[PDB]
Amino acid sequence: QDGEALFKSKPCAACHSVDTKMVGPALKEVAAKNAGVEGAADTLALAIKNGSQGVWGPIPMPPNPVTEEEAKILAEWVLSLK
Numbered sequence: 001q002d003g004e005a006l007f008k009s010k011p012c013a014a015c016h017s018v019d020t021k022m023v024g025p026a027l028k029e030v031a032a033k034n035a036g037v038e039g040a041a042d043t044l045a046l047a048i049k050n051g052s053q054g055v056w057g058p059i060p061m062p063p064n065p066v067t068e069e070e071a072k073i074l075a076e077w078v079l080s081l082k
């Protein structure tokens with residue numbers, strides 16, 4: 001259930017990367033712009049449940065399979081990485 005095991009178990013590493021951008025934003029890019037800030041955790045949690053349109057690059061993201069407890073652990077891991 002942790003962000004390191006959920007990034008490899010769920011289909012997030014297919015489009016996203018750990019350092020450089022592949023098609024959308026990378027884990028190092030979302031942590032550099034939003035480094036543990038209130039408001040960004042709610043926008044990143046609502047973006048994975050509904051979808052993002054024009055924020056990091058030209059490619060959009062569809063609504064991924066994630067619950068309220070998984071969106072809070074994934075939002076806190078992308079803001080503060082291990």
Ligand code: HEC
Pocket residue numbers: 010011012013014015016023024025030043044045047048052053054055056057058059060061064065066074078
């Ligand atoms: C390719 C089909 C993707 C997969 C699979 C996942 N994501 Fe994604 N994500 C993708 C793009 C192209 C973008 C940028 C969209 C834009 O308009 O710029 C994103 C963005 C995110 C974000 C940031 C949202 C924001 O800043 O508002 C997060 C937090 C994010 N993606 C998370 C995420 C997770 C947890 C995934 C596995 C369940 C996942 N993404 C898969 C493209 C793709």
